[PDB]
Amino acid sequence: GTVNWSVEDIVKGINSNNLESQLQATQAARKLLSREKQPPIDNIIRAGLIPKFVSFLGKTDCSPIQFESAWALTNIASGTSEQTKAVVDGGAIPAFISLLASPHAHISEQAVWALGNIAGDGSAFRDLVIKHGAIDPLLALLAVPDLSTLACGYLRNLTWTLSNLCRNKNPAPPLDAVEQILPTLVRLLHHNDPEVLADSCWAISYLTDGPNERIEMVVKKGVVPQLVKLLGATELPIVTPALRAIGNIVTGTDEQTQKVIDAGALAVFPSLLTNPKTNIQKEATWTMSNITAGRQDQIQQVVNHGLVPFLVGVLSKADFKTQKEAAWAITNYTSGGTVEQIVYLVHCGIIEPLMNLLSAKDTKIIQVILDAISNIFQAAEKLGETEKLSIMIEECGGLDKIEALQRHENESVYKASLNLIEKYFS
Amino acid sequence: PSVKRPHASPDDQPARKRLDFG
């Protein structure tokens, strides 16, 4: 019927002065742009159709042509930045915002999706969507006593569009808009649908990837207990952003980090540090490393939860990126920790896997390991057991690798290596 | 000298853009 037209026919139809011919041609266009194999977005743009579609968005008397043009423009705006830009240059943003209040749920949903595609282009179009006033009507669509009365696809689309309004940096979203959105976001974070939960956690992680003041406005809403709960979930699509958000939050101040510890997060890390997905392991170790960079009572919480043997484990056998994060965690631990704590680190077995890692080619990991070794020796000199440790390192082959490192391309590497040998092995 | 280190490469994430197939 409207299946498989040419751009030529679609143009003649749009250029007739017959609303029903126009509707037929607009549906033909939509069906060309909804096929799988490489829709002809550029052909459609070149024929001059965007302005017409945009004008059809305002035809209140013909809701079907509103729907078909909204869908066609959604699919054009899902393409390259140049194609999204063509949609924005046609005046589409204010017209989609007007459509957000349509009494037809499928037209409203299509408007939501199109605005999400436009904001997903980047910071400039995100901020332009916000300036035209989208947040107010978007949030009004969700202002119901119980989210569970909304249709599932509708709620998932609204959530994804909100998440894109919270996304990207340079700049981050305006602070007034973040405060407008957060309450609804926390509500969606307590919903029971897994796709709503995953996209809400993603939005929260976007907002916590910033300076401590963004982190603070998120933590003041009390989402951390719910994030820890989600950190426990079985669906990887929920654990992944929940762990990202927790990690972001612990890049902040010691008191924000403490809010995470007090919600129970550490109890989850035995699973996370042994997770079969490499990315979970790496992200959990990066989080651990930012926790061992905290205060001594926080390091002691790490110890009490039994996580040092898990760090020894990831350092012994893991993807090399995870191992580099584990080295960072060890160095932050030996920098900030008490003597009892560093002794404990050594009694758990850190030295041998730490030494095995000095055979690696990455220069910064080697530098970090040497800093950690320094910190450990310097805990030993406070106890006079420095000879026992020197022996321990000699016995697993570490001192061989340090000597070899004396002659390294990096300056500080050779400097630290020679210092170590001439200061503890003579 | 311990330091908190933000995420190496932040950008499994949701699609930035989505085609509507039906």
Author numbering:
A (entry chain B): 72 to 497
B (entry chain C): 139 to 149, 159 to 169
Manuscript excerpt for this entry:
These motifs may be either a monopartite NLS (binding to only one cargo-interaction site on IMPα) or a bipartite NLS (binding to both the major and minor cargo-interaction sites). We have revealed herein that the N-terminus of VP1, from an AAV isolate from bats (09YN), interacts with host IMPα2 via a bipartite NLS.
A structure was obtained of AAV 09YN Cap-BR in complex with IMPα2 in which the IMPα2 was structured into ten sequential armadillo (ARM) motifs and AAV 09YN Cap-BR was bound at both the major site of IMPα2 (ARM 2-4, P1-P5 sites) and the minor site (ARM 6-8, P1ʹ-P3ʹ sites), in a manner typical of a bipartite NLS. The P3 site is occupied by AAV 09YN Cap-BR Arg165 which interacts with IMPα2 through hydrogen bonds formed with IMPα2 residues Asn188, Asn228 and Trp184. The P5 position, however, does show AAV 09YN Cap-BR Asp167 forming hydrogen bonds with IMPα2 residues Asn146, Gln181 and Trp143. The solved structure also shows the minor site-binding region of AAV 09YN Cap-BR contains the canonical ‘KR’ motif typically seen. These two residues, Lys142 and Arg143 both form hydrogen bonds with the IMPα2 protein in the P1ʹ and P2ʹ sites respectively. The P4ʹ binding site is occupied by AAV 09YN His145 which holds both a hydrogen bond and salt bridge with IMPα2 residues Glu354.
